[PDB]
Amino acid sequence: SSSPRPLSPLVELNTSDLIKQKKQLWQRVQHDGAQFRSTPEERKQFKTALITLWGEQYRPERQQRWNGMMQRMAQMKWNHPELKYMATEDLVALQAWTTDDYEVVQDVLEKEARPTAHGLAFAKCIISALHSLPEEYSYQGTVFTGEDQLPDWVSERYQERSITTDRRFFAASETKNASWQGMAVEWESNSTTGKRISMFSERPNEQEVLFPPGTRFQVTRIEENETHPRLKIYQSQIA
What we know:
Blueprint: H1 18-32, H2 40-52, H3 59-79, H4 88-97, H5 117-132, E1 141-147, H6 151-157, E2 163-165, E3 170-173, E4 185-191, E5 195-196, E6 208-211, E7 216-224, E8 231-238
Parallel strand pairs: 4-8
Antiparallel strand pairs: 1-4, 2-7, 3-6, 5-6, 7-8
Helix pairs in contact: 1-5, 2-3, 2-4, 2-5, 3-4, 4-5
């Protein structure tokens, strides 16, 4: 009888055996592929995760933020009828991905990551959004990424002539803009179904393409340099 809605309007996140939850989610991602979809219950869990992400004292502010994102995305579905089958909370997840909230979810399905309930809830709605966006949101072209990862991080995940099944939310840009920092690792990735999320982003001047965990890349070449980029990865998305 605890936490009735008039006293506690957010559903509590499932905190039991997070390692098992992460294993079950990764199995589902691989099995469901492009048919992965968040359930109504998972969308409500994602609502709790987002509103509570900063702790109790920020829930009133983050509730207002949540309401504003929901309104923006409901309006977006109306103004862009190709999106009318999207779940509003899945679109909100794409907007949330483009905020600083991304750190809770980017790596949550990595084998060695410590999972959190918040990250797992975010992940389900982002993955659902990416696989439910219509095909006109897919980008066909080379997309660009830079990250400050260590050499062993790269070699644990990418090998020339091998297929990487990426467990990360892997972000890239359609454009290779000048940047203030030369990154330790760069990628050139050929996208076939990577999804353009600029329409949903909080940084509308960006042209971000986002791949979900489970994306497969044929790694064709890894270049080494003595200075940045220490590693440059050339890879191509495959079915």
